[PDB]
């Protein structure tokens, strides 16, 4: 999630 990998991450 620190790297927006996955777009559902909080923030992404």
Given at each position: ?12
């Amino acid at each position: 999630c620190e790297l927006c990998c996955n777009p559902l991450c909080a923030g992404c």
